[PDB]
Amino acid sequence: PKVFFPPLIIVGILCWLTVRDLDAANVVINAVFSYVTNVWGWAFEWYMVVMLFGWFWLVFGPYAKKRLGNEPPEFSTASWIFMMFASCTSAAVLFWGSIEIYYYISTPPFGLEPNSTGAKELGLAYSLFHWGPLPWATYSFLSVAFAYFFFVRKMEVIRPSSTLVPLVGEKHAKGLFGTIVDNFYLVALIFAMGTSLGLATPLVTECMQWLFGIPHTLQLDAIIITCWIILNAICVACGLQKGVRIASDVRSYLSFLMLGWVFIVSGASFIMNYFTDSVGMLLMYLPRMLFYTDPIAKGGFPQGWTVFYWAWWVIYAIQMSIFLARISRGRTVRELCFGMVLGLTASTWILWTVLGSNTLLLIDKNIINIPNLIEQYGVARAIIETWAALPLSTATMWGFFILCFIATVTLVNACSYTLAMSTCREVRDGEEPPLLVRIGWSILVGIIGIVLLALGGLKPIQTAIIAGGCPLFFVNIMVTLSFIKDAKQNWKD
Amino acid sequence: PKVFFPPLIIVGILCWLTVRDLDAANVVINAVFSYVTNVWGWAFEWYMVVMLFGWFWLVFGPYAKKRLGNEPPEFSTASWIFMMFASCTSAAVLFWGSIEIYYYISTPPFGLEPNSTGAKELGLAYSLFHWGPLPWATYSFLSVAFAYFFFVRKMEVIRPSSTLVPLVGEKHAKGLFGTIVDNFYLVALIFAMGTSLGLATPLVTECMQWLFGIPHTLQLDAIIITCWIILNAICVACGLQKGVRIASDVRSYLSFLMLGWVFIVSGASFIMNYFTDSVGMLLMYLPRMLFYTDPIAKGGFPQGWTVFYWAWWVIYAIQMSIFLARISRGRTVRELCFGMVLGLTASTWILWTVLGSNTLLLIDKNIINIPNLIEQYGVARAIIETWAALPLSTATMWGFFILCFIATVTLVNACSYTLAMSTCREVRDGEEPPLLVRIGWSILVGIIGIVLLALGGLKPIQTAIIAGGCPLFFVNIMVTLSFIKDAKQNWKD
Amino acid sequence: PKVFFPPLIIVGILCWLTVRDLDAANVVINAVFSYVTNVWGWAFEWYMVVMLFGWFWLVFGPYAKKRLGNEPPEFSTASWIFMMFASCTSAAVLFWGSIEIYYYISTPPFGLEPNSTGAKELGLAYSLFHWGPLPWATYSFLSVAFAYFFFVRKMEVIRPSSTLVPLVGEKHAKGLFGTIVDNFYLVALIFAMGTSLGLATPLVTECMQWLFGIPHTLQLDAIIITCWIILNAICVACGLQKGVRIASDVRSYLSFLMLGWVFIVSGASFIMNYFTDSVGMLLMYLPRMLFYTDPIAKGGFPQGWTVFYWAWWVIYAIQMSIFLARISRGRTVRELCFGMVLGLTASTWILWTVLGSNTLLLIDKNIINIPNLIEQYGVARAIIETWAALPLSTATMWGFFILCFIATVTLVNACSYTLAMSTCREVRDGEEPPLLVRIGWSILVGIIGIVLLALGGLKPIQTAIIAGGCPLFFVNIMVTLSFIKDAKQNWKD
């Protein structure tokens, strides 16, 4: 209703208004980045620092030690920690967990010389930063919030974000404020779903030139994305999880077998060392990476990575918190705070150290002095060469195509559901109306997906997330303030 | 009496014994510095580390959580935190908060190359060190002390420092020990008041060559200082705070408007970044700056700055603690510990980041490649060029002359009062005797003021503080030991 | 019995199987090092990190605050802290506390250039790491264990390590597992006693070419070691501590007088600074040194030092913990945790800063540009030149020969006792059997001693400890797991 159409038009105007002119599009998107980034980047860091302090308070202060709800944990502790370990479902992870370290060593932070021994020493470590405990802790607050809104303050938070900012909401969030926030939210949240898409596709697509060599061309990106949505509409068409249940159970079965594979093959001893050293590098540099900013040098690093990644982390905040909340009925506040960081950091670290060491090795020993060169056709390209360069370069590259495919096939569905529930009747779940609704936003996510690929930079996707979280930085501080002042007076049994 | 004359003569002998020979004076003062500094510098650091650990204990151990006195806080919490934010009343702050960063970038710590990109990266950060939480926490102990001596242990501490070392005082501090400590104290405490003076004057004086261009010459320094004391004697002459009450209320009104001005003009976005980066630099380097010493290199930095600043911080210790104590009736021990650091660090940080960024910008973009050159006539000079180089270079430079003037006019009075109470009848306040007493020490502070300017280095003022705190390092450890062993057995309600 | 012969043969086969071929011996020992080190080094670091976290839990969690036994502390607090300060009894300490800093500055960590100003800046600091609180805290756990096994869980732990792994021991450690662990233990524990020996001798021996110049030759190493065991057998021969009691009381009297000497002479002011700076360097670099690994550079440092030293620390773990446990009857868990680190770190720091500054000074100011050159005959050599170069180069070098002699004379005995009790009747102490047993292992420790010196590297002794702790890393994790799960359910009064 008041949240349905607003996105719809805002995207649409942005679309054939982008599709009309990409040479001019790629100059606005380009200037907004170097605006929001250079001018307001510090805000994004301070945000995460504050949310990080959040985690300490949540752990050591008042509402720690206090049963986040009724008695009974719906899942066992280990089932819980694993439920988190396995929750990663995105393929943009395999993208970034592949070239990230390459970009770190080619343009280092800290004025270290490109490709130097030192540059390489900080590579994995900066992954361990960007994807370790810190960012995962910045979820604890909005988690313990959205979980308190659920199991102690039995006020089931209807999907939109507004349905929980009355406790702060001066101008009743059931009105305009709440609505102009929920679509502000939804818009970035779709753009992000569009950014995952417009990364996950080229990986599958390029994987395809390793299957009797079907080409990659935008057209082919364009075909496989719609080939998604159809296979995903005709998946909703009838009711039975005899496929989509076991799908996820494979996507995680395969991913751990594939990373186990890269781990073992890449050399266990090397990684066990490079990890160890990178921890100490991380710990050493942690305060410097947090507040790493427009140096007087003006290199653009943290601006390019930290600030961009953090916007992204901002966008999927509450979202990931509803999830973490919904699987944590019985837990203490402190339990969640620990459990999630342990569980999530474990899955995220293994990923980037494994895939990213393997990349560093390749770049280092002259085995595919390609990334640098291969950027003369495709980033996405290099990333699969990174897979390619491995033992049994067939069974892997297949494992990589399938795991990479049925990963994004599960993404398209779960976040068209999440996207439908946010514009629907309150009462139950996917009842009578939730139909051509889900199947339509599929088309919408996907069409922004190619829109970006048409523009073809990394910027198009970078600015997309940045502009996204910019708003949702506020939306987040709100949901969390809203939570405190409630809980504040509404606890102390 | 036993504290009046001793200072008087010790200063006097030092005076026309300096005034006889400055070319020989500037060789003793020169050798005592490079004595006390190089040989005993570590002591000053360890001191501050210990006092810093102090703050942790004070916060997490026993006397935390325990009402520092009776029930009722004389001021509200916000009035309290602001009372601290606004308490800065010195102009030597505007001196150091101006050239400090210049000196950091021209002679860096850590063997970084002068003027390099890296040197500049550490500039503000080292201000944030020297003037952030750490040094301000090293006050908490002597605060919670002098505040305990007041509101739980109703034993109103008569102005001299001795009147509270019997609880430790083996050879009753009411005797000789106590007395030879109170003038040892008073002597450095005046020398310091003399050092503030002999910095605050040239700022006003040079500001004056921006007022139809009245010269600066020592003579003119000499005239304006006595022009102080007269305007300050004839201020005591009759009783009414229809001027000296509203004076302070202006000096703080103007300073925040002037720093707000420099902030906005200098570029908000730049500063917000340079601050952010400098925090992370500070946090990164904090353990290294604390214990930063005579490297094997023997560069002289920490020796020159850290050790000198810390002596200064040592001197105005108890003094600033009586003050902080006297405004904190109702507070908890932990409250004070937090409140003061927050409140004080807030005011101190804003200052040095604002004024000091503005300086770095100027030095950086070739806009006044002067500091280096302008040192061929005046440091004090450069500092106002730093003001000068700003938009509406008239309204500012006036704002800077006035704020800089009526700042030191309030300094001369408040610390001639503090200087009079320390040599007076116990009973009440400024009763019958406190008259020609206050007006005389005015003359004494001021005359040491020019004495230094006659010698004209930064050393004269540097060694002055160093030699000062050297003693008072002990005097401090005393007042604080004295406090513990009392409180120790004299608490646990 | 089941622990007596197994060592005996395992050493013996290793002996004339080494003594047959040193040119081939020095190629296996050489390859096992660069195996265990390069491939499994991280394990040794993680171990110490875990044990370091151990100390936090032991201090802040459950069994803190809880009387480690009955009421009465057998020794006073100060007697206790000193008992720890003085417990150092090894001469390999004077070896490492002598050339360590030289090796740090000649091959630095972190890619700093050999002999550079920066290299020297990190020298002492890396000693403060390797021999400060961290490693000493990694004892707290096995201490609080072995002390709990004693005074709350009155189950006097018969000397072998197995006699306390039933609480974990699945396949009853009274059987084979326990036995094949106790000799696995004993073997490394002797090898280590052999490594102390094969370092302590050349120090005494070279000290001897400063006594009308008796030569040093292996033969002479070989003679003085047996001259040990005889003087040590004929020490057991009859019963009276009219010599061996007052021996220790001298060895510690002399060592503190000798280090007091080097301290004062070397320049108090310099050291007080170099210490101070090195603390801040240590604190700064601490997370980096902990996890310092096979860089991508592959320099071999941490591999060479950290990993080797840590193996050593692993070997003398439980051993040093039985000791620390046995002197801490009345103490709280937290008490021990603090007491030991304070006490032990105090003795260890003073040592390496004093001896190691003195070395740096010598290397620095061109006063004995010898270490580099003198390695063309003896490391052991250089180390005494380091003593030699001092004021009253006779009274010292004598003090160094005697303190260095009667230090190792006490070592040979105390750890042939410890070595005998581990293969003996349970009931009392040195009863009827404990005789030709102690005197025999003397011969065994000593013969491995020269075996190493015959091979003559630092590697022979380095790999000896490495291979040692490799096993005992496990043996340690065991004794400590075993302890938790007992205490776990067997506490909570």
Ligand SMILES: C[N+](C)(C)C[C@H](O)CC(=O)O
């Ligand atoms: C990471 N990367 C290379 C995409 C962006 C850079 O960090 C910023 C830049 O290119 O200057």
Ligand SMILES: C[N+](C)(C)C[C@H](O)CC(=O)O
């Ligand atoms: C999709 N991905 C993981 C790359 C971006 C988001 O940060 C995911 C997340 O952190 O939960």
Ligand SMILES: C[N+](C)(C)C[C@H](O)CC(=O)O
């Ligand atoms: C990252 N994203 C949005 C793809 C997935 C959600 O954040 C978490 C989920 O849907 O389980």
Ligand SMILES: C[N+](C)(C)C[C@H](O)CC(=O)O
């Ligand atoms: C995670 N989620 C919501 C999909 C499944 C439920 O949490 C499990 C349940 O409600 O029993």
Ligand SMILES: C[N+](C)(C)C[C@H](O)CC(=O)O
């Ligand atoms: C800061 N300054 C330049 C005044 C003193 C220096 O740090 C010491 C020096 O000049 O060597």
Ligand SMILES: C[N+](C)(C)C[C@H](O)CC(=O)O
């Ligand atoms: C006058 N000033 C501020 C420069 C030196 C003292 O350190 C002031 C203070 O710290 O309270």
Ligand SMILES: C[N+](C)(C)C[C@H](O)CC(=O)O
């Ligand atoms: C710094 N000084 C001495 C100028 C002022 C006092 O320390 C504080 C005060 O008088 O309020």
Ligand SMILES: C[N+](C)(C)C[C@H](O)CC(=O)O
């Ligand atoms: C700060 N001081 C002492 C000047 C004013 C008083 O604290 C206020 C009062 O005593 O009511």
Ligand SMILES: C[N+](C)(C)C[C@H](O)CC(=O)O
């Ligand atoms: C310390 N030392 C020199 C014995 C071993 C080195 O660290 C390793 C090496 O020689 O490469």
Ligand SMILES: C[N+](C)(C)C[C@H](O)CC(=O)O
């Ligand atoms: C003999 N020494 C001290 C050199 C090696 C061991 O580490 C000693 C110890 O740490 O207890």
Ligand SMILES: C[N+](C)(C)C[C@H](O)CC(=O)O
């Ligand atoms: C280091 N070592 C084994 C020589 C001595 C023991 O560890 C401690 C002791 O016997 O007191």
Ligand SMILES: C[N+](C)(C)C[C@H](O)CC(=O)O
């Ligand atoms: C340290 N040790 C065991 C040698 C002596 C005893 O602890 C002292 C005692 O048992 O009275």
Ligand SMILES: [Hg+2]
């Ligand atoms: Hg679009």
Ligand SMILES: [Hg+2]
């Ligand atoms: Hg994934």
Ligand SMILES: [Hg+2]
């Ligand atoms: Hg998506």
Ligand SMILES: [Hg+2]
């Ligand atoms: Hg793929």
